[PDB]
Design an enzyme around this catalytic site. Sequence first.
Site, PDB file in Angstrom:
ATOM      1  N   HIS A   1      14.526  10.961  37.571  1.00 44.90           N
ATOM      2  CA  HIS A   1      15.723  10.772  38.361  1.00 44.90           C
ATOM      3  C   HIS A   1      15.966  12.015  39.188  1.00 44.90           C
ATOM      4  O   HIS A   1      15.402  13.086  38.927  1.00 44.90           O
ATOM      5  CB  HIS A   1      16.966  10.497  37.493  1.00 44.90           C
ATOM      6  CG  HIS A   1      17.022   9.106  36.954  1.00 44.90           C
ATOM      7  ND1 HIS A   1      16.308   8.726  35.846  1.00 44.90           N
ATOM      8  CD2 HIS A   1      17.698   8.009  37.372  1.00 44.90           C
ATOM      9  CE1 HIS A   1      16.536   7.444  35.602  1.00 44.90           C
ATOM     10  NE2 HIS A   1      17.380   6.987  36.504  1.00 44.90           N
TER      11      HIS A   1
ATOM     12  N   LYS B 244      21.458  13.273  38.173  1.00 43.59           N
ATOM     13  CA  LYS B 244      21.526  12.459  36.957  1.00 43.59           C
ATOM     14  C   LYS B 244      21.530  13.407  35.780  1.00 43.59           C
ATOM     15  O   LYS B 244      20.480  13.865  35.330  1.00 43.59           O
ATOM     16  CB  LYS B 244      20.332  11.527  36.866  1.00 43.59           C
ATOM     17  CG  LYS B 244      20.287  10.780  35.545  1.00 43.59           C
ATOM     18  CD  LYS B 244      21.144   9.588  35.679  1.00 43.59           C
ATOM     19  CE  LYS B 244      21.118   8.767  34.439  1.00 43.59           C
ATOM     20  NZ  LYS B 244      22.093   7.671  34.651  1.00 43.59           N
TER      21      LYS B 244
HETATM   22  O1  6PC Z   1      23.393   6.851  41.327  1.00 47.52           O
HETATM   23  C1  6PC Z   1      22.464   6.439  40.580  1.00 47.52           C
HETATM   24  O2  6PC Z   1      22.008   7.192  39.676  1.00 47.52           O
HETATM   25  C2  6PC Z   1      21.902   5.029  40.774  1.00 47.52           C
HETATM   26  C3  6PC Z   1      22.527   4.147  41.652  1.00 47.52           C
HETATM   27  C4  6PC Z   1      22.035   2.896  41.831  1.00 47.52           C
HETATM   28  C5  6PC Z   1      20.929   2.499  41.147  1.00 47.52           C
HETATM   29  C6  6PC Z   1      20.305   3.379  40.270  1.00 47.52           C
HETATM   30  N1  6PC Z   1      20.793   4.634  40.093  1.00 47.52           N
END
Ligand code: 6PC
Length: 230
Positions: free
Chosen positions: A133, A137
């Site tokens: 990520h 995150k």
């Molecule tokens: O902001 C995020 O971490 C996110 C947002 C939409 C889909 C997956 N992750």
Amino acid sequence: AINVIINGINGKMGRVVKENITAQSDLELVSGTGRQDDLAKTIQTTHADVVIDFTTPQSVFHNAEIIIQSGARPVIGTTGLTLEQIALLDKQCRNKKLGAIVAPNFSVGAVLMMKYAKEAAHYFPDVEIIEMHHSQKIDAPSGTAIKTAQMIGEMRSSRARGEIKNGIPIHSIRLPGLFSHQSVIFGSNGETLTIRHDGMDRNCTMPGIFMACRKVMELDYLVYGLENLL
Ligand SMILES: O=C(O)c1ccccn1
Ligand SMILES: NC(=O)c1ccc[n+]([C@@H]2O[C@H](COP(=O)([O-])OP(=O)(O)OC[C@H]3O[C@@H](n4cnc5c(N)ncnc54)[C@H](OP(=O)(O)O)[C@@H]3O)[C@@H](O)[C@H]2O)c1
Ligand SMILES: O=C(O)c1ccccn1
């Protein structure tokens, strides 16, 4: 013609939903509401059929109650609802013959990744998860990786080596340039099978969200989990 409100219209997700909904001909954005707007009032003024909620864990339950009590159907992406709250929302939905969708993950790709990983774990007991990520995150492992491990561990049961969750090592990469990625890698004699989801940006949730807006009209109860609309 489905009249939709976006609750949380100024947030990161609310803004993306606003951009994409225009191209959905069977949906009409009739209002976008934020923290200091009166949601019940707006539902009544606009004759809203559906309210998409991308707000905060502190508000999501009361928002859901307001939406149902006002006669519209919640499509809730916000995280934060407890088991007991979901069970109560379900009884409220069925009492009024109004549908609702609560999806912890609105990405079709991510939900299918989890579905096929759970199936494959019946054949390949050895498996690890790699999730990656962007650095914003903060949580590691990600909620999606933890849920994936839960599903895999259930099917089986029926320091560099990662964090074990329900028996499954999870490795968490955090780097600029990524958005949301996960690879479930199964191993056996002479081969691997990898199920990999790559979420490039927040449009990755839109087919799941708009699908929910449509299916929630045909429902008279609450559906938990995008996989149950598929
Ligand atoms: O902001 C995020 O971490 C996110 C947002 C939409 C889909 C997956 N992750
Ligand atoms: N289910 C999924 O696939 C998925 C995907 C992405 C995100 N999410 C979840 O959805 C939620 C929203 O995420 P995000 O990235 O959009 O967060 P965000 O950027 O912080 O946006 C949240 C928005 O909600 C507004 N808000 C706060 N309280 C409200 C209330 N009582 N009524 C109406 N609006 C209110 C905020 O307004 P202000 O600007 O005034 O503060 C803000 O605009 C989070 O819980 C996140 O984890 C779920
Ligand atoms: O189905 C779930 O409970 C789930 C899915 C993805 C992320 C967190 N939770």
